[PDB]
Every structure is written in structure tokens, then in C-alpha cells.
Amino acid sequence: SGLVPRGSHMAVSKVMEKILRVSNIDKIFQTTTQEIRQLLKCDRVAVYRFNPDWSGEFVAESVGSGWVKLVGPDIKTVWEDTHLQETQGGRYRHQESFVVNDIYEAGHFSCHLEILEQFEIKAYIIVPVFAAEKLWGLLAAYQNSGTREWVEWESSFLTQVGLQFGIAISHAEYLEQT
Amino acid sequence: SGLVPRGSHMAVSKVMEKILRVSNIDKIFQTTTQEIRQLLKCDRVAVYRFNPDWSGEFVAESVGSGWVKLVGPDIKTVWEDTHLQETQGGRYRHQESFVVNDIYEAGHFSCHLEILEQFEIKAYIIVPVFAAEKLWGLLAAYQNSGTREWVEWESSFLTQVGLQFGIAISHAEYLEQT
Ligand SMILES: CCC1=C(C)/C(=C/C2=NC(=C\c3[nH]c(/C=C4\NC(=O)[C@H](C)[C@H]4CC)c(C)c3CCC(=O)O)/C(CCC(=O)O)=C2C)NC1=O
Ligand SMILES: CCC1=C(C)/C(=C/C2=NC(=C\c3[nH]c(/C=C4\NC(=O)[C@H](C)[C@H]4CC)c(C)c3CCC(=O)O)/C(CCC(=O)O)=C2C)NC1=O
């Protein structure tokens, strides 16, 4: 019997069309984080951009009602993570994605737990965004309402959109090139 | 622990870069069918294009040594399939993909089996290629050496490249638009 279209495949395909047709990458990030958050039924999806010193800030997001807005006019949410700085991007530098069903089961340090608790994160998936051969930032999906048993299609989907964001950034650089 | 890059994800991402940078869609089909065939370790990967009457022909392929070449200069391999014609594209019109581990276990008619046997096909995956809202053709992976227990990542991968071929064709149309 046939295999009908899958949500993740159709969402990734839609991102590709936007990259082909939309020059405003901010707008691609804003609409795409929204589409991802709807498909994953999670509480926040965010793009985090590294600074040269490996600190960074949230630059785009979609967030459900009842959770704090971390991106917007006259807001700048910075996270200067000393592990990511010391290691120049952690495992993400090696193009690894990471899946955490329960932040209390991951062996995080308490100062890291504190920040996760501040953003009300209970479970997450984090993937790399590479532009050219450099780690440019991270794309993350968060569950704030409770723990979550993420499945393979969900982590693969988020990884694939991270690749597409990377291509979007790279292509914009290429086009300019004036 | 981290999830390292997956072959299918990196291959789909490479196709997207080609679509952004390469105007020659023939060339995208030829190099991409080769990449797919290597990753799937199968014997033939082919793009089949429909004519207005729902007959069609193979327009690009990668094929292993020892199997017949069906695409090339001064060759035209047509398959006029009466089921696909009568139904205007079969299940593929509804954007369904199809996975067959063993052609003898699928309930095919003997005249269909005959053609499959002519091309030495034992097992296959077939996916749609849509350009705009129209079924433009099919992208197929074939095992000729024996039956094959295809797995989910393989069918998802082929489906995703079918979507990307569709976007490639659509975008080329859009750009012309002169
Ligand atoms: C996309 C936004 C985002 C960021 C930036 C983030 C940071 C972050 N901090 C990490 C680890 C870490 N972070 C810290 C430490 C600290 N962290 C601090 O903010 C303090 C300044 C300092 C206290 C000393 C340490 C010690 C680790 C490694 C141990 C652990 O996993 O907690 C990890 C590693 C998890 C892994 O891949 O194993 C991430 C992803 N998570 C996110 O979702
Ligand atoms: C990409 C290249 C390619 C093509 C075109 C192809 C054709 C093809 N013929 C099909 C069915 C069919 N084809 C035919 C009949 C015929 N077929 C003929 O070539 C004769 C003219 C005629 C004899 C009457 C019939 C009766 C069916 C439906 C029953 C069956 O599954 O065999 C199906 C349906 C399988 C499904 O989705 O269930 C396909 C995909 N397979 C491929 O890999």
C-alpha cells in the first residue's frame, strides 16, 4: 500500500521553496520556527546565533501562549555558555544533534539547569546550523509543559531544517557577491 | 549522546545546494541519481517523465555495471503503462510513494511482471515528482540482483529527493519568466 505525504517532508520542502524565492532570511526564520512548532506541538522553537567569542543570542523564535517571549523589538536574550565557549561550540562543532527527553536525566551542571529552569525548559532537541564550513548557531525545539519522549522523525526533521537554515545563510552570503 | 550526520540528510542538503547554484536540471538529475544509487547500494536509479497522455520515458539514470543502459544518446526507453494512463498517474497522482521488497509478492499482472523482468527488476521504491500541482513523473530505485527488505529511511530519502526534483523543475519554469 501507498505511503501518504509526511508532515516533516512537506515542511522541509516548503522551506526549500522559501529559500529559492524569499531573500529576507529573518522572515524565513520567523515563519519556519512557527511551522516547526506547530508540527512538533512543542512550546518554543528558536534560532540561536553565535558571536565570534562563542557567546550568542536568540535571533528568531515561535513561542506558545503563556511562555515568555525571548525575541522581539527592544529585547535581546543572550546566553553566554562557558562550556560552549571553552570548546568552541561543543558537540555541535562536529555536526552532532542532541535529544533530551528530560533535563534532569541528562547530567547537566546545576548552573546550566538553573538557566534551563529560567526558560521553563523540560525537554529539548538541539541541532547545528552550519554556514559554509563554520558553526553559525543552533536551532532548538523545547517542551516547557513537561518531559517528552521525542521520536526519530522529530529529531531528523529538526536536523534537516537546521541544514536548510545553514544553506539559506550561506546562499545570502554568496549572492553578495554584490 | 550526539547524533552524527546521516547520509540521506547530507545528500538531500547537497541536492538543495545544486538547485540554488546549477541551472542545468539534466545535470542535477544525472549527478543526483548517481549519489542516490551509491547511498542505497542499489542497481538502478531513474527519473521517468510523463507525456500528456500519461505514457512516459526514462530521462535520467544511474546504473551499475552489468545492467542494461536505458538512458543515453540515441536511446529512448519508453514505458506506456495502461494502468497509469487509465488512472492518470495511479496512486502517484495522490502523492503516494510505493515500496516493493519482492515484485512477485505485490500482486502485479503478468504483463507488468514481464516488463519488470525485462529490466531485471526484483524490488523497488517509486516516488512522485510533482511540478507545480501537476504529477510530472516518477523517481524510482531498483534492486536487480535480488529481493530487498527496504527500510524507512530509504523510502523517506527517495521521497524527499522526488520533492526536490519537483521544486527544481517548478523553479526553472518560474525563472522563465524570461
Ligand atoms: C540554543 C540555546 C541553548 C544554549 C546556548 C544551550 C547551552 C548549553 N550548555 C551546555 C553545557 C554546559 N554548560 C555549562 C556551564 C554553564 N552554562 C552557563 O550558562 C553558565 C555560564 C555556566 C556555569 C559554569 C556546562 C558546565 C556544561 C557542560 C555540562 C552540562 O551538560 O551541564 C550544553 C551542552 C549539552 C550537550 O550538547 O551535551 C548546551 C547545548 N542550550 C540551549 O538550548
Ligand atoms: C518509473 C518507471 C515505472 C513504471 C512506468 C511503472 C509502471 C507501473 N505499472 C503499474 C501497474 C499496472 N500496469 C498494468 C498493465 C500494463 N502495464 C504495461 O506495461 C502493459 C501495457 C499493461 C498490460 C495490460 C496493470 C494492469 C497494472 C495494475 C496491476 C499491477 O499492479 O500489475 C504500476 C502500479 C504499482 C502501484 O503503484 O501499485 C506501476 C508503477 N513502474 C515503474 O517502475
TrEMBL record, chains A, B:
<feature type="binding site">
    <location>
        <position position="112"/>
    </location>
    <ligand>
        <name>(2R,3E)-phycocyanobilin</name>
    </ligand>
</feature>
<feature type="binding site">
    <location>
        <position position="91"/>
    </location>
    <ligand>
        <name>(2R,3E)-phycocyanobilin</name>
    </ligand>
</feature>
<protein>
    <submittedName>
        <fullName>Methyl-accepting chemotaxis protein</fullName>
    </submittedName>
</protein>
<feature type="binding site">
    <location>
        <position position="79"/>
    </location>
    <ligand>
        <name>(2R,3E)-phycocyanobilin</name>
    </ligand>
</feature>
<feature type="binding site">
    <location>
        <position position="142"/>
    </location>
    <ligand>
        <name>(2R,3E)-phycocyanobilin</name>
    </ligand>
</feature>
<feature type="binding site">
    <location>
        <position position="109"/>
    </location>
    <ligand>
        <name>(2R,3E)-phycocyanobilin</name>
    </ligand>
</feature>
<feature type="binding site">
    <location>
        <position position="108"/>
    </location>
    <ligand>
        <name>(2R,3E)-phycocyanobilin</name>
    </ligand>
</feature>
<feature type="binding site">
    <location>
        <position position="92"/>
    </location>
    <ligand>
        <name>(2R,3E)-phycocyanobilin</name>
    </ligand>
</feature>
